Design a protein around this ligand. Structure first.
Ligand SMILES: OC[C@H]1O[C@@H](O[C@H]2[C@H](O)[C@@H](O)[C@@H](O)O[C@@H]2CO)[C@H](O)[C@@H](O)[C@H]1O
Ligand SMILES: OC[C@H]1O[C@@H](O[C@H]2[C@H](O)[C@@H](O)[C@H](O)O[C@@H]2CO)[C@H](O)[C@@H](O)[C@H]1O
Ligand SMILES: *[C@@H]1O[C@H](CO)[C@@H](O)[C@H](O)[C@H]1NC(C)=O
Length: 398
């Protein structure tokens, strides 16, 4: 969509680059909301309304073709990100799901480089990524996410998409969702927006989940028909890693009886360990709280390989078939090596209550507990804060 007259005022966020020799050193980054979360309206004289809702192609009246859509649909800058629940303070990013006035912005943001015109590309195979988090205001059913997608570095800036990454264009993920614009272009044929996704963190105060999701396509692929489906180009389910799912119940939760006590802030470390020819072999998650390293649990479940790291053996044994078919750990690592964009969001699930995150095999949450209608009765204003985003040499971030 065509950028409007309203200014885009990106929140600034300080992050760090770390080495063993130099420690963690500060760097300036910026935060951008998803393009389609910006106000979208029509060109002068065309009346009120937008250019399509999530799940659909854009409307044919204004978007009969890409070229017309590019001129008839206007994407406004956001001059006050706090209106969308997004604020920063030094090295902290706060994402508010619900505002005091009852709006539910459910923000999704990407990390821009210091120029504001290219995403900060992270290349994490053989390195580690670490952050601090306050998860206290995330009950059952909430998903605070911090993850990587293989988006184009300028958001595919082009003739019909002059806005690019500066306006948050180019989103994709392993679900191949249909959005009315893809790569800043009207999605006239209603294709899905597919790409490799590494879910570093999907969590609330009750459960913590890690999952790589492979696709058999590089970068953003516009899928059609069965390509967008379960036996298509991307791994919808991922290879999930959650202590509950591997029969460890005392590792992560609200209270002193959990190794990681989500009533207080903590640090989350993720290492992407490569084999001697440079390909990803293992993904290792551990934590730090109150100045003490909390090593990963090991799996504790009959029929599940004994391990403290995500690898092909574990993924295959736990039924992650599409993960394996669409590239396995090596394929996930090849996407990581090519470069990925960092996305952070907070969201809830009206359909399915986020049961896969924190219910049943996945956590302590009861049936119905994660419904949005109940979430607001438990925590009226869910939010997450991510602090001191930092990445670099193995062993150097913590
Ligand atoms: O379900 C809608 C939300 O999707 C979130 O993205 C998911 C993504 O679809 C999935 O493949 C995986 O990579 O985990 C992501 C993080 O939970 C968005 O972040 C959120 O904004 C919603 O659109
Ligand atoms: O429900 C959408 C949700 O699915 C997750 O994958 C789940 C899957 O739903 C479930 O059948 C399986 O047993 O566990 C998986 C989690 O390990 C995806 O991970 C998530 O991204 C959503 O797409
Ligand atoms: C689950 O863990 C408990 C505690 O360690 C153990 O007693 C039990 O046998 C485990 N169950 C399975 C299916 O492995």
């Amino acid at each position: 969509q065509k950028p409007g007259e309203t200014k885009e005022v990106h929140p600034q966020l300080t992050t760090f680059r770390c080495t063993k020799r130099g420690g963690c050193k500060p760097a300036t980054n910026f935060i951008v909301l998803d393009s389609l979360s910006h106000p979208i309206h029509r060109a002068e004289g065309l009346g009120p309304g937008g250019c399509g809702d999530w799940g659909n192609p854009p409307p044919k009246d204004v978007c009969p073709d890409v070229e017309s859509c590019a001129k008839n649909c206007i994407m406004e800058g956001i001059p006050d990100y706090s209106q969308y629940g997004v604020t920063t303070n030094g090295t902290s990013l706060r994402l508010q799901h619900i505002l005091p006035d009852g709006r539910v912005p459910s923000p999704r943001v990407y990390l821009l480089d210091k120029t504001k015109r290219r995403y900060e590309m992270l290349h994490l195979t053989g390195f580690e990524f670490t952050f601090d988090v306050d998860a206290t205001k995330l009950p059952c059913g909430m998903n605070s996410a911090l993850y990587l997608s293989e988006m184009h570095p300028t958001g595919a800036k082009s003739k019909y998409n002059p806005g690019g990454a500066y306006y948050g264009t180019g989103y994709c993920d392993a679900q191949c969702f249909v959005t009315p614009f893809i790569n800043g272009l009207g999605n006239i044929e209603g294709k899905g927006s597919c790409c490799n996704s590494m879910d570093i963190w999907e969590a609330n105060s009750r459960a913590s989940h890690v999952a790589p999701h492979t696709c058999n396509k590089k970068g953003l692929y516009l899928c059609e028909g069965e390509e967008c489906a379960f036996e298509g180009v991307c791994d919808k389910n991922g290879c999930g890693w959650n202590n509950y799912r591997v029969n460890v119940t005392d590792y992560y939760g609200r209270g002193e009886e959990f190794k990681v006590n989500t009533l207080k802030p903590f640090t989350v470390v993720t290492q992407f360990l490569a084999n001697r020819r440079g390909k990803l072999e293992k993904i290792h998650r551990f934590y730090v709280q109150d100045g003490k390293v909390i090593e990963s649990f090991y799996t504790n479940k009959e029929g599940v390989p004994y391990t403290n790291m995500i690898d092909d053996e574990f993924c295959e044994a736990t039924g992650s078939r599409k993960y394996m078919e669409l590239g396995a750990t090596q394929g996930m690592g090849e996407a990581l090596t090519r470069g990925m964009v960092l996305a952070m969001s907070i969201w809830w699930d009206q359909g399915g209550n986020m049961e896969w995150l924190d219910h049943g095999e996945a956590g302590p949450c009861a049936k119905g507990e994660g419904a949005p209608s109940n979430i607001v009765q438990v925590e009226p204003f869910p939010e997450v804060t991510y602090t001191n985003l930092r990445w670099g040499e193995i062993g150097s971030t913590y």
